[PDB]
Write a protein that binds this ligand. Structure first.
Ligand SMILES: CCc1sc2ncnc(N[C@H](CO)C(=O)O)c2c1-c1ccccc1
Ligand SMILES: OC[C@H]1O[C@H](O[C@H]2[C@H](O)[C@@H](O)[C@@H](O)O[C@@H]2CO)[C@H](O)[C@@H](O)[C@@H]1O
Ligand code: NA
Length: 512
């Protein structure tokens, strides 16, 4: 296996207290003789699933809890085994954040929420509403200052505004219901794009540009998390931390993250990782080391949270958190963030209109579930000979299914001999063999030009396999088969599918 035994490699994001974490690691090495290496690679949240899937990577990965369902579903995280007495040292709602499919899949460290951070010497009374920002910027611009700069390249930072007047990710979790292009989301993003059109913000502003501007005293406000506070202390800007402005009378709703530590499932060092996490990091002295480097927010460790909760910055953090929501941890969170990131960037730049951007995001976010509904229904009715009587809950699903029935009948008829021969060559007998189908379908499906004819052929093969599985009394393998096909299709063809307008495109192409 790629990972080395008898040491710990930790990955953590570069905005967090990695030097303090390394200090904890030195203490661990002094007591145990085991060397701890902390790294902060770029795009670690994308890198981790690529390397961990091959049995490589770090022993411990730190990130907000939202990405970890995905990791867990993919087999990349060890289940953790804190005993009762350890469990009781952290807040139950922090453990709830790192529960997937009933199992604990990470240790919670700290609760993060975005707040409004403001320069008390420029703006002694910060605005309660978004709507008053344009006027305030006009006033500040007369003195060579701006009202507000924040990172527009990561949707995390814009989401509180998008969500304020009723935007939402997944309904509280009903995965069918995405609220990315409803009228509330549209309103929020239109307000953001108007700020930009009226020269109150610049589309190119990123994390670094906003942080420098605030920390040099050029802009009166930023939006950021507790990790930013250290660098402002150093700058000698006199700052406060407050509740985010309202929009159309409603609170900004930040997406709340629980910084968490997961154990790589390929690690031969799981017991050392546990010892590090429970007996060195999640203690008063351990969290203090990290916190002194870059503040964590409101920590999951009750003993130390009682001291931090007296800080008015932490109170503000908790106030904003209470108005927002805990992020979901479902495997499609990754696709939701990619889709919303693109939408914000394209709306802010003018590359798409607000309505066009958010339509594309809504299609990207729901792609996996929508594809699965269609493909699973088709596979099961082909296998059994009868359709599923439940409603879709679904206009696109229903028409796409109708289309697939019409087109797929022809394909399965014409390809029957070839499909017979391919199935005989692959010998799919049970759930273990459906696992092996993925590698073959990626190769055969991907190494080929993409068009809807080829997608129908893939799904038609699926249906033909489903009928065989039913005949051999393996009907319980049909759902996993459908999941596997949907996985190959959407992992490899996502961008083409979105550009083709998803399943509405399919329906239009074969209309005919
Ligand atoms: C794993 C079996 C699969 S998956 C798939 N996906 C798209 N096209 C296919 N075939 C068409 C026409 O055969 C193509 O390559 O354009 C296939 C075949 C498949 C099934 C039987 C024989 C050859 C390929
Ligand atoms: O922008 C989408 C992004 O948001 C969250 O990432 C936060 C992270 O939680 C914080 O710890 C801080 O580091 O800033 C990040 C924003 O750049 C999600 O946790 C993440 O999965 C998502 O891609
Ligand atoms: Na990053």
């Amino acid at each position: 296996m790629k990972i080395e035994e008898g040491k710990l490699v930790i990955w953590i994001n570069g905005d967090k207290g990695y030097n303090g974490l390394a200090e904890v690691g030195k203490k661990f090495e002094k007591d145990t003789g085991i060397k701890v290496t902390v790294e902060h690679p770029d795009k670690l949240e994308e890198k981790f699933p690529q390397v961990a899937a091959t049995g490589d990577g770090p022993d411990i990965i730190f990130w907000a809890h939202d990405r970890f369902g995905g990791y867990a579903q993919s087999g990349l995280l060890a289940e953790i085994t804190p005993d009762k007495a350890f469990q009781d040292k952290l807040y139950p709602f922090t453990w709830d954040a790192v529960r997937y499919n009933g199992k604990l899949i990470a240790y919670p460290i700290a609760v993060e929420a975005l707040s409004l951070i403001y320069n008390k010497d420029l703006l002694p009374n910060p605005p309660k509403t978004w709507e008053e920002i344009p006027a305030l910027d006009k006033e500040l611009k007369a003195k060579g200052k701006s009202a507000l700069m924040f990172n527009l390249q990561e949707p995390y930072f814009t989401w509180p505004l998008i969500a304020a007047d009723g935007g939402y990710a997944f309904k509280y979790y009903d995965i069918k219901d995405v609220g990315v292009d409803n009228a509330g989301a549209k309103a929020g993003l239109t307000f953001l794009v108007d700020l930009i059109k009226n020269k109150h913000m610049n589309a190119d502003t990123d994390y670094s540009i906003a942080e420098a501007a605030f920390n040099k005293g050029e802009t009166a406000m930023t939006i950021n998390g507790p990790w930013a506070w250290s660098n402002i202390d150093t700058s000698a800007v006199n700052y406060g931390v407050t509740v985010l402005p309202t929009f159309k009378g409603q609170p900004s709703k930040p997406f709340v993250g629980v910084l968490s530590a997961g154990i790589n499932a390929a690690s031969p060092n799981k017991e050392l990782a546990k010892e590090f996490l429970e007996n060195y990091l999640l203690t008063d002295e351990g969290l203090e080391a990290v916190n002194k480097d870059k503040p964590l927010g409101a920590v999951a460790l009750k003993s130390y949270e009682e001291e931090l909760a007296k800080d008015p910055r932490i109170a503000a953090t908790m106030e904003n958190a209470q108005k927002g929501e805990i992020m979901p941890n479902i495997p499609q969170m990754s696709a939701f963030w990619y889709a919303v990131r693109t939408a914000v960037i394209n709306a802010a730049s003018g590359r798409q209109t607000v309505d066009e951007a958010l339509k594309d995001a809504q299609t990207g976010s729901e792609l996996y579930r929508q594809s699965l509904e269609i493909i699973s229904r088709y596979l099961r009715e082909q296998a059994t000979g009868a359709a599923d009587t439940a409603p879709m809950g679904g206009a696109t699903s229903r028409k796409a299914l109708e289309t697939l029935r019409r087109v797929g009948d022809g394909v399965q008829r014409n390809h029957e001999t070839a499909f017979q021969g391919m199935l005989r060559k692959l010998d799919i007998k049970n759930e273990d063999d459906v696992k092996s189908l993925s590698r073959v379908m990626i190769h055969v499906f991907s190494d080929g030009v993409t068009n809807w004819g080829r997608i129908v052929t893939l799904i038609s093969f699926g249906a033909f396999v489903a009928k065989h599985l039913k005949t051999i009394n393996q009907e319980s393998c049909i759902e996993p088969l459908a999941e596997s096909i949907t996985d190959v299709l959407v992992r490899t063809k996502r961008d083409w599918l979105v550009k083709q307008r998803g399943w509405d495109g399919f329906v239009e192409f074969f209309h005919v």
